[PDB]
Amino acid sequence: MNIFEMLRIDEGLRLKIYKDTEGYYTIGIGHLLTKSPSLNAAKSELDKAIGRNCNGVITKDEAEKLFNQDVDAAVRGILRNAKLKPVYDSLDAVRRCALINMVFQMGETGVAGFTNSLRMLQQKRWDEAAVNLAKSRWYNQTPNRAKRVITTFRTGVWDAYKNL
Numbered sequence: 001m002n003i004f005e006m007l008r009i010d011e012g013l014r015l016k017i018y019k020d021t022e023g024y025y026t027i028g029i030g031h032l033l034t035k036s037p038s039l040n041a042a043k044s045e046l047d048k049a050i051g052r053n054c055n056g057v058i059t060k061d062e063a064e065k066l067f068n069q070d071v072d073a074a075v076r077g078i079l080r081n082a083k084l085k086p087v088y089d090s091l092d093a094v095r096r097c098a099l100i101n102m103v104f105q106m107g108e109t110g111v112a113g114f115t116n117s118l119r120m121l122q123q124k125r126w127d128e129a130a131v132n133l134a135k136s137r138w139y140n141q142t143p144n145r146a147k148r149v150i151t152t153f154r155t156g157v158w159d160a161y162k163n164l
Contacts, residue, residue, distance in 0.1 A: 001158045001161055002097075003071060003097050003100055003101075004067070004071065005161075006097055006101060006158075006161060007029065007030070007067075007071070007100075007101060007104060008029055008067075009161055009164045010030075010101065010105075010145050010148070011029050011030030012029070012030075013028065013029055013060075013063060014026075014027065014028065015027075015028070015057060015058055015059070015060070015063060016056060016057055017033070017039065017042055017043070017046065017056045017057075020032065021141065021142055025039065025041075025042035025045075027046060027058060027063070027066075028058060028062070028063035028064075028066045028067060029063055029064070029066070029067040029070075030070075030104070030105070031049075031063075031066045031067070031070060033045040033046055033049070039056075042056075043055070043056055046058070049066065050062055050066075070104065071100070071104070074100055074103045074104045075100060077103060077108040078099065078100065078103055078108070081108050081112060083112040083118065084099070084103070084108065084111065084112060084118075086122065087099065087118050087121055087122050090121075090122050090124075091121065092156055094152065094156050094157060094158065095121070095152065095153055095156055097152070098149050098152040098153045099111070099121075101149050101152075102149060105145075106138065114133065114136070116132055117129050117132045117133045120132060121153060126153065126154050126155075126156075127154065129153060129154075130150050130151075130153060130154040133146070133149075133150050133153070134146070134147075134150060147160070148160040148161060148164070
């Protein structure tokens with residue numbers, strides 16, 4: 001299992017513009033287009049993102065291209081972030097994937113706000129950090145996905161995704 005397979009389990013694949021758990025306009029493999037309520041603003045972002053007139057619909061191909069860019073940006077964002085970098089460097093390969101997953105879903109900023117959990121992950125206090133991560137809007141709003149990520153940080157193995 002790898003980061004791409006992991007995120008693809010969590011995000012799914014949709015070739016037509018759709019709404020987030022959050023009600024936001026998205027397409028592909030969790031590629032948020034706009035936080036704006038107009039389908040029209042979303043369509044415009046889409047064509048800008050793809051470089052063609054898409055009319056709200058993309059190919060598998062285009063979806064994976066956006067996915068490659070998004071993953072790349074997430075990692076680079078982690079590497080550029082003063083708060084995130086040190087945690088990332090301290091982690092093993094599997095747990096590194098769990099932090100990437102969080103950044104992809106919630107952005108650099110959002111994750112950098114989990115101050116106490118970050119501190120615990122750096123210290124390698126797995127059970128403590130898992131308990132603290134669960135105390136969040138994140139967990140309450142998308143419990144099945146949060147719990148997969150959390151188990152991943154807890155165990156350091158890919159079992160939560162074995163099932164799926």
